[PDB]
Copies of this chain bind each other. A is one copy, B any other.
Amino acid sequence: HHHHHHVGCSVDFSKKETRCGTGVFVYNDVYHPDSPRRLAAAVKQAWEDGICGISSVSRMENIMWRSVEGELNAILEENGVQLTVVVGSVKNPMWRGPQRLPVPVNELPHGWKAWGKSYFVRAAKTNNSFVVDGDTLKECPLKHRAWNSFLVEDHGFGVFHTSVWLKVREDYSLECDPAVIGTAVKGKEAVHSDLGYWIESEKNDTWRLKRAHLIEMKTCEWPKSHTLWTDGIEESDLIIPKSLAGPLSHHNTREGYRTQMKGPWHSEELEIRFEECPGTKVHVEETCGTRGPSLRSTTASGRVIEEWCCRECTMPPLSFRAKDGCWYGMEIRPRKEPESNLVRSMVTA
């Protein structure tokens, strides 16, 4: 019926029309970490070489560690290693660790093979704990933690069969795994995306950021291989910071805005949108305050400030939508209310 590798159909949903064909399709998609023995050996070596724990790149890696925890600890127990892997909650932003899990090239002896084992006995706890995120910087600082250690294999990831085959890197790097990245353009609309970011861009006088949905705040570097228009861009003209996995792209820009370093990156989940916060208004006045830490539309008392301003940004105003409320861009300050009364972002990319 067809001699191609991929076939897809777009739906026009009222016409009853339906266009099929072949090509490349980027959907809004917003675990086998090596052989068990090899991973276990990597963790043993990790402790034995100073690395106390892990800072996950994404909300994937964390979930994986969580789903591997039992078998990993059991195998560590089998081969005489008093060490317990503890997997905690994801903390935003997902900070960059200087370490990475070493390839042992000498996998632990008496584990088995596959990753889907059950009905076994859980291992015992230990004073020695291999930490994985979850509010534990006090007992294990960032700078002794592995980060971005895993790479998806060649055909390791797919959406139709939800297996994800991973390996421990041979090299250290800052690049986000390009296996799960999908970027596309069509006429005056475009998108950069992965499993966490959904970043839309449009064409209105200039190419620019339309809106973005972040489900995580990672700090890896979005590869240019999977980025559009990567030349002639001052890093400070971006919206989503480079150090926040923002694509080095002209698509990642907006007239009258600079890099949102001090955005509300402590949030679980943000929706960067160009719309006034509910009940608020914004004026473009050169008498407004200078750009500073992103402020929330509501005070700690939940009091909603009405009038805001910006020195020379453009409308509609940049804003972040989190569960705790609505934040404004760095350029946008309260017009009348003194900044000292408002909730500010205590974080920096």
Interface residues of A (CB under 8 A from B): 4-19, 21-29, 154-155, 157-161, 178-191, 193, 203, 207, 224-232, 248, 250-251
- Roughly how many angstroms separate A294 CA and B7 CA in the complex, as a whole number? 35
Question: Which of B13, B180, B225, B248 meets A5, CB within 8 Å?
Answer: B13
- Roughly how many angstroms separate A340 CA and B13 CA in the complex, as a whole number? 59
Do A17 and B226 touch across chains, with their CB atoms under 8 A apart?
A: no
Known contacts A229-B224, A231-B231; is-contact A190 B24 (Cβ 8 Å): yes
Do A13 and B21 touch across chains, with their CB atoms under 8 A apart?
A: no
Contacts of A18 in B (CB 8 A): 160
A152, chain B: closest CB distance, angstroms? 8
Do A159 and B226 touch across chains, with their CB atoms under 8 A apart?
A: no
- Roughly how many angstroms separate A10 CA and B227 CA in the complex, as a whole number? 23
Contacts of A25 in B (CB 8 A): 8, 10, 23-26, 184, 186
Chain B, residue nearest A8 (CB): B10
Question: Which of B11, B155, B159 meets A8, CB within 8 Å?
Answer: B11
Contacts of A190 in B (CB 8 A): 24
- Given contacts A185-B225, A225-B228, list 5 more A-B pairs with CB under 8 A: A8-B9, A25-B184, A182-B186, A182-B187, A226-B229
- Roughly how many angstroms separate A185 CA and B160 CA in the complex, as a whole number? 18
Contacts of A157 in B (CB 8 A): 187
